[PDB]
Design a protein around this ligand. Structure first.
Ligand SMILES: Nc1nc2c(ncn2[C@@H]2O[C@H](COP(=O)(O)OP(=O)(O)O)[C@@H](O)[C@H]2O)c(=O)[nH]1
Ligand SMILES: [Mg+2]
Ligand SMILES: [Zn+2]
Lengths: 203, 26
């Protein structure tokens, strides 16, 4: 019997926390592999859906993004993607369109999720009102916090529903995750979740 | 379709190596 797996490329400015993020998933981290001809650790992240097991094969960079754009060999056969920026860092958000372009160019029309990492930090710079890129297109957006696991599963659930074409797909159990190294205040999470809704119904 | 045991990409039978990292099929 053949398995269900997708190549998921993880792009965004260096320092946004991509590596921190893919690593929250213990089994993915320990079974991850290493394409040395491309400088890339692939991380098999299995999620258990009410329909069965699904594997996102997340391609994480060995840092080459701080010094320019990535090679086609990286984007090849991508079947979905996550774009990440740092909410403490406006420039990372300003380079989001840049990544999106370099992506679409190689991956004509694949599902993409935009992610605001580091929401755990109090002094945030890129509030919900500023987040607008996803308004256009086929770009679902979630606040996330790698270090507290906050919304870790969201990006993946949303990507699974598109690649399966099942709006009613559910994860039966949350995968095994590294213990949250920082806390995610329920206040911030509540204000930030609320600041996301009171934006989608507005402009 | 077989799978490359280096990067996990799903290549084709007509492919004899990997269309992503140029790695040989075993
Ligand atoms: N506060 C906080 N810091 C984070 C989070 N994720 C990553 N970082 C920090 O951001 C820095 C760069 O993270 P890294 O995963 O290496 O970013 P990458 O270059 O995108 O792969 C590190 O010092 C991390 O500790 C997060 O969710 N919250
Ligand atoms: Mg990294
Ligand atoms: Zn390969």
């Amino acid at each position: 019997e053949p398995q269900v797996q997708f190549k998921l490329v993880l792009v965004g400015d260096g320092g946004t926390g991509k590596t921190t993020f893919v690593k929250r998933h213990l089994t993915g981290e320990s079974e991850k592999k290493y394409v040395a001809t491309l400088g890339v650790e692939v991380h098999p992240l299995v999620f258990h859906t009410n329909r069965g097991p699904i594997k996102f094969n997340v391609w994480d960079t060995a840092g080459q993004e701080k010094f320019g754009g990535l090679r086609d060999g990286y984007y090849i056969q991508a079947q979905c993607a996550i774009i990440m920026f740092d909410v403490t860092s406006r420039v990372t958000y300003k380079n989001v369109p840049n990544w999106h372009r370099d992506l679409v160019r190689v991956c004509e029309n694949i599902p993409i999720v935009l992610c605001g990492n580091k929401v755990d930090i109090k002094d945030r710079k890129v509030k919900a009102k500023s987040i607008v890129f996803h308004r256009k297109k086929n770009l679902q957006y979630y606040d996330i916090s790698a270090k507290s696991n906050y919304n870790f599963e969201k990006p993946f659930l949303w990507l699974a529903r598109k690649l399966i074409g099942d709006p009613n797909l559910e994860f039966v159990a949350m995968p095994a995750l590294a213990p949250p190294e920082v806390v995610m205040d329920p206040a911030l999470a509540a204000q930030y979740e609320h600041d996301l809704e009171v934006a989608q119904t507005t402009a | 379709s077989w799978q490359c045991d280096t990067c996990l990409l799903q290549n084709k039978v007509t492919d004899n190596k990997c269309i992503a990292c140029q790695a040989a099929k075993l």
